[PDB]
Structures are given as structure tokens and as C-alpha cells.
Amino acid sequence: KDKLNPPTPSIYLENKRDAFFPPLHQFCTNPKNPVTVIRGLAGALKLDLGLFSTKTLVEANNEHMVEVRTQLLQPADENWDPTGTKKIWRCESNRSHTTIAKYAQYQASSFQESLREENEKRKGPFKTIKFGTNIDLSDNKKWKLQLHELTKLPAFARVVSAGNLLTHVGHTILGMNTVQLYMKVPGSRTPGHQENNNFCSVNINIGPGDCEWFVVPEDYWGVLNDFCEKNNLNFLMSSWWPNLEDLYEANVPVYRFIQRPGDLVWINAGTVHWVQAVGWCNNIAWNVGPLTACQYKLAVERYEWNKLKSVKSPVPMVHLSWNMARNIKVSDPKLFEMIKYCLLKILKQYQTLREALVAAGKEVIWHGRTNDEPAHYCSICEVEVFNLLFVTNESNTQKTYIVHCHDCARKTSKSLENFVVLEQYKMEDLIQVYDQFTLALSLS
Numbered sequence: 001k002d003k004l005n006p007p008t009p010s011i012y013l014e015n016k017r018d019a020f021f022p023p024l025h026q027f028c029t030n031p032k033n034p035v036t037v038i039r040g041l042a043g044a045l046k047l048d049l050g051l052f053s054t055k056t057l058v059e060a061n062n063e064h065m066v067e068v069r070t071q072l073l074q075p076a077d078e079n080w081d082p083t084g085t086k087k088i089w090r091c092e093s094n095r096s097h098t099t100i101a102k103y104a105q106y107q108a109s110s111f112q113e114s115l116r117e118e119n120e121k122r123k124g125p126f127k128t129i130k131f132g133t134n135i136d137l138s139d140n141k142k143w144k145l146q147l148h149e150l151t152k153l154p155a156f157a158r159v160v161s162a163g164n165l166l167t168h169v170g171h172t173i174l175g176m177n178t179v180q181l182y183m184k185v186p187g188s189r190t191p192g193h194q195e196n197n198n199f200c201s202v203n204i205n206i207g208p209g210d211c212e213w214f215v216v217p218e219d220y221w222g223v224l225n226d227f228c229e230k231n232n233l234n235f236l237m238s239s240w241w242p243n244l245e246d247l248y249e250a251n252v253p254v255y256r257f258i259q260r261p262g263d264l265v266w267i268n269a270g271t272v273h274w275v276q277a278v279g280w281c282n283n284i285a286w287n288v289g290p291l292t293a294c295q296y297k298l299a300v301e302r303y304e305w306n307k308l309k310s311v312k313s314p315v316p317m318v319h320l321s322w323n324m325a326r327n328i329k330v331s332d333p334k335l336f337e338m339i340k341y342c343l344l345k346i347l348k349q350y351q352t353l354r355e356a357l358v359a360a361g362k363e364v365i366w367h368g369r370t371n372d373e374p375a376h377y378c379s380i381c382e383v384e385v386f387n388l389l390f391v392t393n394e395s396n397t398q399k400t401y402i403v404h405c406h407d408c409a410r411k412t413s414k415s416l417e418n419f420v421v422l423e424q425y426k427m428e429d430l431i432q433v434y435d436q437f438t439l440a441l442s443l444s
């Protein structure tokens with residue numbers, strides 16, 4: 001079908017007015033648009049992209065860490081097995097570390113070398129390339145001018161804003177509410193994925209070269225999960241590059257487009273995507289969580305799915321849900337009912353566990369909390385642990401407070417005789433927050 005190759009939802013900005021025009025924000029967060037390409041964004045705002053050039057980055061922090069992926073240079077939109085016999089989903093992508101200064105040297109010599117081949121005149125085997133990915137730009141003292149430039153964006157796309165759920169988590173989540181940088185040569189690939197806990201994402205191409213994007217709507221993700229499983233791949237943990245002919249056969253629509261320097265790509269919640277550099281360029285990216293029923297719903301879904309698959313959730317959705325109820329006036333009835341439902345479930349589970357402990361003669365110790373203290377995860381299984389913390393007698397005395405969930409503590413110590421139970425919130429107080437959480441009136 002032509003319907004299997006749909007057009008790209010696109011918007012063309014000329015000036016600051018187009019960029020701050022409220023219908024732009026509405027268009028991006030509309031569930032019907034899996035992706036929005038905002039063309040000419042940096043030009044419209046007069047953003048100085050030179051602050052993110054490789055020359056500038058070397059001058060700023062030349063010894064900064066870079067994660068290196070070593071890959072094969074594949075043709076166009078395909079992925080072949082090493083021998084060049086057939087197209088397969090598994091990608092080769094070996095990891096190591098380098099510095100900005102050393103990768104910059106490779107990026108430049110790569111370009112010079114291709115200029116020479118181009119002046120040498122006239123199925124693989126395939127060449128090896130290196131991709132510099134996941135560069136951490138969270139430190140405001142090291143990247144002051146870079147981070148300040150991104151505050152020039154319209155509020156809905158900023159790393160920090162009052163309407164961003166990730167701003168309401170209350171603590172740093174590396175690479176989600178902090179910026180990541182990518183340094184590339186032609187063929188550099190980001191393999192197939194959904195964002196952490198299905199949060200929206202923003203990506204800006206610094207240039208000077210182009211990137212090519214491939215996008216599949218959220219509601220087809222189960223089909224791609226099946227494909228991975230049938231090819232001995234973990235959808236969440238493995239590196240895979242979809243065979244477009246497999247997808248077409250399975251009637252999965254694929255959005256395909258070019259991202260030019262200064263173009264901003266908005267990836268909506270749960271949208272599946274993979275990317276390759278066409279030329280030499282850098283990119284920057286981070287996550288955003290719009291206050292919509294759609295975003296909250298997909299975030300909760302992936303949170304629960306990650307438990308089944310034994311994968312850690314970077315976003316602590318229990319911690320976040322209480323913060324929303326404490327600090328955010330919710331005027332959408334669907335969104336309000338979703339949050340209320342979740343809090344009620346947390347509250348009942350917490351009540352059940354607490355009374356089981358008390359009925360069995362186990363002391364609950366009042367421990368309390370520091371404000372802005374991050375959520376806790378189980379030191380063994382990495383599930384989020386809220387309020388009732390399980391700590392060993394020894395870690396307690398030493399004041400190390402190494403957190404365990406109830407299930408892991410039990411599996412170790414049958415009657416919890418090796419543990420103490422710490423409580424961070426009084427029950428009356430959580431009941432109060434829940435009770436005072438009501439639907440606000442908005443006429444919008």
C-alpha cells in the first residue's frame with residue numbers, strides 16, 4: 001500500500017513567532033502524530049549551533065568521556081550478515097571508551113580520507129566505522145554556554161520546564177532530564193528502540209551533514225517484539241536493525257525522512273525508531289514528558305512491562321505519581337482518573353504489607369526522609385522500592401542503609417530475622433495527599 005509509506009508530519013518555521021505559536025505544541029503532543037519534524041527550528045530562533053561543533057567541544061573539555069560503538073558500514077537501509085549472504089535483524093555494535101579529543105581526531109581524518117578516495121577516481125565485504133555516542137553534558141560548570149543556549153527553545157521542548165513530568169521527578173535522571181551528545185561519521189547507527197519508559201524525546205542535528213530516520217507508530221511495537229523473539233533477540237536489550245521487506249510483508253507502516261542541520265525531531269510517546277548518519281555531523285538529545293493521559297498511560301505500561309522482563313526502569317513512576325498529586329493541578333478528567341487509580345493501588349498494597357508485618361510481630365521503624373532525596377531501587381533486583389525499606393541489621397548499624405525490596409529480603413531471610421523495616425512516610429500523611437488530590441476546573 002501507499003499507506004505503508006505514509007508522509008512525514010512536518011512543520012516549517014521561519015521566525016520566532018512560528019516557534020512560539022501554541023498550535024505547534026498541540027500538534028507535537030497529539031497521539032495521532034507518531035513523529036513531528038520541525039524544519040528550520042535553529043534558524044527561526046537564531047540558535048548558535050557552533051556551540052556544539054567538534055572544534056568548540058575539544059576546546060571546552062578535551063578529556064571528556066565518549067562511549068564508542070564500533071560498527072560495519074552497511075548500504076542504504078539494509079543490514080547484512082557479515083558474510084553478505086542474507087539480510088538479518090542482529091547488528092554488530094561493540095563497545096569501548098575514548099575522549100572527545102581522540103574521537104574528534106578520527107572524525108576529521110575520516111573526512112580527509114574520503115576526499116582522497118573521491119580523488120582516486122575509479123554483498124560486502126564491509127568496512128569498520130566508529131560512532132561516538134551517549135556523551136554526558138549534565139555538568140553546568142563544564143557546559144555553561146551550551147546549556148544556556150537551549151533555554152532559548154519554546155518551553156514545551158526545553159530540558160527543564162514547569163509542564164515537564166521529568167522536571168517533577170525532583171532529581172537527576174541521567175540522559176533524560178540532562179542532555180546527551182553524539183559525534184558521527186557516515187553510517188553511524190542508533191539501533192531500534194523505544195525511549196526509556198516511553199517518554200517523548202527531542203533531537204537536534206548540529207550538522208554539517210544529514211541524518212536519515214526510520215519510524216514506526218507505538219501501536220505496532222508488539223509486531224516488532226515478535227520479530228525480535230523469533231530471531232533470538234531481546235527487543236529491549238539487543239542491537240537490531242529492522243528488515244524493511246519483513247515489515248512491509250507484515251503490513252507495518254514505516255515513516256521515513258531526512259533530518260538536516262537545525263531541524264528538530266519530536267519523537268512522540270512509545271514511537272519506535274532507528275537512525276543513521278548520511279554525512280559527518282553531531283546531534284543532541286534528551287527526553288520530555290507532556291502532561292497528557294497518553295504519556296502517563298504509556299509510561300506506566302512500560303514500567304510494568306519492564307518488571308516482567310527483569311529490566312530496570314530509569315523513571316521511578318511511584319515516586320513521580322505522588323509528586324504529581326502533591327504539586328500539580330490536573331484538569332483533564334482522563335488523566336486525573338489514571339493517577340487517582342494508581343495512587344489507590346499503591347496505598348492498598350502498602351496497607352496490606354504493613355499490617356502483615358505488624359501482625360507477625362515485626363517492628364516498623366520510623367526513618368523519615370530528606371527532601372529532594374531520590375527514589376530508591378532494590379540493590380538486588382532493581383525494582384523501585386517505596387516507603388517501606390528493607391535493610392540488613394548490619395547495614396542499619398553501619399548507617400549504610402542498603403535498600404532491599406520485601407521479596408528479595410524474604411528470599412534471603414525467611415522470617416526477616418536478618419532485616420529491619422524502615423518507614424519513610426506516615427500513613428495518615430499519604431492518605432491526606434490522596435484525599436486532597438481532586439480534579440481542577442479548566443475551561444480550555
Ligand SMILES: O=C([O-])CC(=O)C(=O)O
Pocket residue numbers: 182189190201202203274275283284285
Ligand atoms: O544518534 C542520534 O542522533 C541519537 C538518536 O538516534 C536518538 O535520538 O534516538
Ligand SMILES: [Mn+2]
Pocket residue numbers: 193194195201267273
Ligand atoms: Mn531515541
Ligand SMILES: [Zn+2]
Pocket residue numbers: 378379380381382383404405406407408409
Ligand atoms: Zn528486590
